[PDB]
Symmetry: C3
Subunit: 289 residues, 3 copies
Amino acid sequence: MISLNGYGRFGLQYVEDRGVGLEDTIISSRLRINIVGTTETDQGVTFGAALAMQWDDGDAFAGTAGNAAQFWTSYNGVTVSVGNVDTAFDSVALTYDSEMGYEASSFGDAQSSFFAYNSKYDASGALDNYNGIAVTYSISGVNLYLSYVDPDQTVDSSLVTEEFGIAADWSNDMISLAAAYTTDAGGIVDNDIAFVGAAYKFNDAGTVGLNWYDNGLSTAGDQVTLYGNYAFGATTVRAYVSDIDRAGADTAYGIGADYQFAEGVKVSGSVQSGFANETVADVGVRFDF
Amino acid sequence: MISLNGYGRFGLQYVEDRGVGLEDTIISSRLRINIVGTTETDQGVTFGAALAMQWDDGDAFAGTAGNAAQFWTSYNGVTVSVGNVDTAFDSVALTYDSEMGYEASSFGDAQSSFFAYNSKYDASGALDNYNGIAVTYSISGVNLYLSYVDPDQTVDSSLVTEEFGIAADWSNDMISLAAAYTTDAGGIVDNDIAFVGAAYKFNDAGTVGLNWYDNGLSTAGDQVTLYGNYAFGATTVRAYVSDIDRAGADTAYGIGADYQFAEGVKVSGSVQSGFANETVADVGVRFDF
Amino acid sequence: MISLNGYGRFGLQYVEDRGVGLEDTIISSRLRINIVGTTETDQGVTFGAALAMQWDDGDAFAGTAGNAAQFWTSYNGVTVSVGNVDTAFDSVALTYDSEMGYEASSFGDAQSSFFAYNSKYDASGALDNYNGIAVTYSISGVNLYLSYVDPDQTVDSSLVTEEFGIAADWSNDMISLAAAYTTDAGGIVDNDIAFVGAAYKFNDAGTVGLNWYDNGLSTAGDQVTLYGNYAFGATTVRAYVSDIDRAGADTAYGIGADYQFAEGVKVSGSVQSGFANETVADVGVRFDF
Ligand SMILES: CCCCCCCCOCCOCCOCCOCCO
Ligand SMILES: CCCCCCCCOCCOCCOCCOCCO
Ligand SMILES: CCCCCCCCOCCOCCOCCOCCO
Ligand SMILES: CCCCCCCCOCCOCCOCCOCCO
Ligand SMILES: CCCCCCCCOCCOCCOCCOCCO
Ligand SMILES: CCCCCCCCOCCOCCOCCOCCO
């Protein structure tokens, strides 16, 4: 069986003083199409393969191609994936929950380098023999994630730095906890990064959380992000503040809102300020199909 | 929801004295696939995104890729589109009605340069930050089209030439009228082009029309195209003559026929002669799927 | 109508002493998606167009694109195809029946160069004006195949070497015969290749066959491949031995097994030894969707 799904988004993206002779406000947009092939068996083992075709404004050649494939096998709550996998640091709950605006961005997300699903081809040639293996297990409320990524599987293993990651998250109705740890993140020796997060659903309508990170070799150093959101009917208000250890950095912060126009259609905007005083704002729509 | 549609065509394309050591007759073919994602809402606002994958004989690398995305939002007869848009000069009725043969070509089409939907990627890098905005409105019988195209939206607007176009068409059962005007067509300063056309359905079976163009900076100068077609059951006969102002040009003319083999299957051919005495002929089939 | 189908495969591929500083065992995988557009008519003539998108581990740029299109028209058992066609030497029955393992490979397959359906784009630019024409006819039990491939159809025909091929196969319940002949195979002057094969289904469960080849200009020379397979319920055992004329070559051989896990899911492995003593092994799964 083959299924197709995806989303489109478009809106205005403002970057204060973007560059000499550059427009500060542009129309930023993205089209993402996922092609998923699945083979179900009467034994209860499902086999699947996925490809993504993603276009973003500014992409080279004004064209769209598929990325590298991901393959998986699922049985009884357990999923093993191979190829272009999702990694543990990128898949754990809570770590991206401060994101806002129609481009789902936040200075409060981790300021470290690590491997993650590659949405597009890479013209440099760096991903040509990249291969990962990931294992996920969802007991019930609990999620366990493991990932191993070899950036160049054809070369002897001792000559290349491989990335190993582990993560887990747990949730009930009001509290959620998550933690992740990755060694040699991004294929960089000694870039060992870690995440610990917690969130409290202080009503059916609002949630407050705190994420803490060890950003490994990044110049940001350790980081803490405090965020919260509150839903008023169809509109959600979101905010966050984040601090990093880097000397002289400003406190980053963001305020935004989402409006659920209809099932699958979300109008969102945000105004944010970064660690170097960058001022960014956006307003747009995402529609799922 | 995602839908796929498209068409294939293949046949023989003859170009008299094509080139030293070149074959005059080749097998010319095209495959076009459209991927359209749409999100309908109970408020009556539809959101959509489209991608095209088009291959033509002779294409570089013997491969096929997607082009740049187009996004739209539709409500009550009004459609706003962003990204890789259809432009007013290219979307107005009547302007391409002299086309014939299985490759839908005519020397009687406008001999000017203007922006239009880009079916494929562009390896030169010229379309990488190209972004347009188009608005269409269909009252009933009346169609209004507006388009604005910025060839490089990231650079300050005063440093780049933007294209602005407007068009309208009107039809009843027997008469149709259309007009279009575009300033700085194709992003070329002072290339201001215009179109005025009219057609008369002088029976349920035949139609005669006249298109007039101001080709802006083109060397062709002003142009007039007289064309007509007549349907005899499943076969349609078409013809046209066209004249341009360029000094010494020949009168161009074409004669062709279409046969409706079945719903979605059309067999067509044509013999045409250009403004420089070029002699071209074709015969092939188009099938829609 | 548009349909999508395909398959994914992944497993372990071992090549003894693959190279200095290279891993002998890698995870080898492939994703193949076929996009087929078809237009059926009430006259009984079907028109179709197909595109393939195929990704393999190690592919340049870690991306996936479509190949060049194939078009066909079918009526009463007869199929005419144009563009990126299947050729007679590659489509005849029996010639690939010694293949084994999850990558469907065999040293017993013909060791000659010939044109065949091109699954992917070609970055060298060699296939840009490649165009073929193929005709197949299936009486009942009998299959006839004809193919003509011009590697560069835009250049005068006398300046380019074209490939011409013919093949036929015949089968009843127990015996099958096949033969193919191709002149100027692969667009190489005087590379004339030939195939004769026969197989005997010596039970409902087992089959033994013999393929003989004239490999044209290849250095392998003539070749003979003896193979057989036997099914025990859901598991099939396969083996082959092959000999070529090249001076000093070793006898190649292979042993493998397939397990039909479920409809559309096959687990397969093999251990093989080549003409130069290469030792290769694999084990993996293919799933169709
Ligand atoms: C095979 C799938 C298609 C992906 C191949 C695209 C190959 C493009 O690059 C060719 C080499 O030249 C380098 C191009 O510049 C960077 C392109 O990508 C970056 C922005 O999206
Ligand atoms: C041309 C530059 C402007 C483009 C930037 C768009 C910026 C728009 O505003 C950002 C969103 O800020 C609003 C959120 O806080 C209030 C939420 O309550 C409002 C409605 O639900
Ligand atoms: C990213 C989508 C795939 C589109 C990228 C193709 C990139 C090809 O070019 C790489 C740069 O080299 C120039 C190629 O020559 C012209 C190709 O296109 C023209 C005919 O269709
Ligand atoms: C090898 C070069 C020949 C390839 C060119 C094909 C040219 C074929 O003819 C063009 C079509 O001309 C015919 C139209 O006018 C008559 C219409 O009535 C006929 C059937 O409905
Ligand atoms: C137009 C469809 C996309 C196919 C175009 C890809 C173009 C890539 O090459 C650009 C020229 O540079 C040469 C690249 O190196 C070889 C790539 O392919 C080989 C392995 O799959
Ligand atoms: C790390 C290198 C190992 C990876 C190579 C996998 C090789 C595995 O074995 C190849 C298949 O050989 C077995 C076939 O013959 C016996 C068949 O009966 C067995 C079950 O149906």
